[PDB]
A and B are shown apart, each in its own frame.
With several copies, the nearest count.
Chain A
Amino acid sequence: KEQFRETDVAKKISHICFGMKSPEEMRQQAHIQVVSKNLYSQDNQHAPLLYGVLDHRMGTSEKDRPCETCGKNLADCLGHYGYIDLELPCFHVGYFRAVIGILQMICKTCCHIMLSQEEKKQFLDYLKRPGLTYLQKRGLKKKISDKCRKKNICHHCGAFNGTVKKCGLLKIIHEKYKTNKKVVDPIVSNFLQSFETAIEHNKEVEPLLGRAQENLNPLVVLNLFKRIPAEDVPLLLMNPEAGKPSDLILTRLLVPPLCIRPSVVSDLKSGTNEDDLTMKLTEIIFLNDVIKKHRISGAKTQMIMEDWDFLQLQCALYINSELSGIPLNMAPKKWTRGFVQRLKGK
């Protein structure tokens, strides 16, 4: 007959469980995929473009037009999330330092946490102590970092690993082929000697033999994070229920409902005041589409890499529009208000 549904339960919140979503759980959560970079239709009615930002299946911002996904009023509608697919993986500003630390905490080939088995067991025992606090967890991570950065080879692999550092703009560099004043490693000789064809087609490559090290792109670090063993996940201080380390690398973007993004149609003029976040979402869609176009048309590899970096910068600005390490020459636009700006400040 009729499916019984309990309207309400007399419950009260006990605690909030913070945690990351996978870009895959992210895609599961979202209702529609945002593909239209442009906002409204060409007709004078200014109809919002379907499957794009400011669609009215995605929450609602105007009193007259209700939510299309949920049949509720502007006030009643809670809002629906959308998802945007990124053709290339992108770093996360909140998790940039985190990925740097993990890459310093695990190797690049064996990928396990890089400490002695006795050190691992001792840290596990100290972590088994009930009720570990936030400050204690930060101290634990710092202790593990200090004891891990003083070695070079993981127990599993034994591959040599140098220091990993941020170079410039959302860029991670690992000097695997360390230059030494002593005898050089055989692996270093193999790596340097194998530039035969590049030197053949470019003499200037040979002077660039040094200062040319392993840079960890978002895609390769995503692949590494996929293959992480579960055993080392607790040693990474990462609660498995909250999220797997692969979730830190962002390859999908949840666009939030129209409840957060206002569209103030200024009746005094022929325009609508719009949030900088919606503009940055439009720019992100444009960047993804133009990356697709350049991949189809076969542009320079360097041009594709610049497109990837500019996408990373766009996502960074969308997350936080106040960064001190952007592309000086590649001037974006002007000052904007990001999510952090909406959060912090008086």
Chain B
Amino acid sequence: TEGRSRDGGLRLGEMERDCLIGYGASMLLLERLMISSDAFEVDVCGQCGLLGYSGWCHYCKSSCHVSSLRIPYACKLLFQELQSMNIIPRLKLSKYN
């Protein structure tokens, strides 16, 4: 929430993230802004490129290309909001190696 009157934590302003980038603390920045703010688990079908649930793909009606992915909850909300406008985001996954 907002602050002390609302028992809210502090806010990482843009400048703080700028300093973190300048230091290059990639994993620390990722943990601070994703793990410690809003962490979510999503499933993506490589065939369709669309989000899925519980290792299942409704659009492809299959579960042979699902995968797990950690995400900011705000990012998932943005994806779904963009979906509502029929601007469908198709995620093209790639192996980490």
Contacts and interface: CB of A to CB of B under 8 A. Distances in A.
Nearest to B48: A29
Contacts of A79: 80
Contact of B81 (A12, A18, A28, A343): A343
Contacts of A6: 55, 66-67
B51 A16 contact: no
Contact of A19 (B42, B43, B77, B90): B90
B29 to A, nearest CB: 16
Contacts, number: 103
Interface stretch (A104-112, A166-174, A222-230, A251-259): A251-259
Interface in B50-97: 50-51, 53-55, 58-59, 63, 66-69, 76-77, 80-81, 83-96
A260 B80 contact: yes
Contact of A8 (B67, B80, B87, B89): B67
Give the contact-size bracket for chain B. Answer: 20 to 34
B92 A260 contact: no
Contacts of A328: none
Interface residues of A, number: 43
B35 to A, nearest CB: 15
B84 A260 contact: yes
Contacts of A18: 87-90
B49 A78 contact: no
B68 A8 contact: yes
Contacts of B51: 78
B93 A13 contact: yes
A10 interface: yes
Given A31-B58, A257-B80, A339-B81, A92 B86 contact: yes
B42 A11 contact: no
B81 A256 contact: yes
Contact of B83 (A10, A250, A254): A254
A20 B87 contact: yes
B83 A81 contact: yes
A16 B84 contact: no
Interface in A18-63: 18-21, 25-26, 28-29, 31
A346 to B, nearest CB: 13
Nearest to A14: B94
A70 B55 contact: no
B57 to A, nearest CB: 10
Contacts of A70: 53-54
A17 B85 contact: no
Given A17-B91, A31-B58, 9 more contacts: A6-B66, A11-B93, A12-B95, A18-B89, A25-B59, A78-B43, A81-B83, A260-B84, A339-B84
27 contacts: A5-B63, A8-B67, A9-B66, A9-B67, A10-B95, A11-B96, A13-B91, A13-B92, A15-B92, A17-B49, A18-B88, A21-B88, A25-B59, A29-B50, A29-B58, A31-B58, A72-B54, A78-B42, A79-B80, A92-B86, A94-B87, A254-B84, A254-B86, A255-B84, A256-B80, A256-B84, A343-B81
Interface of B: 42-43, 46, 49-51, 53-55, 58-59, 63, 66-69, 76-77, 80-81, 83-96
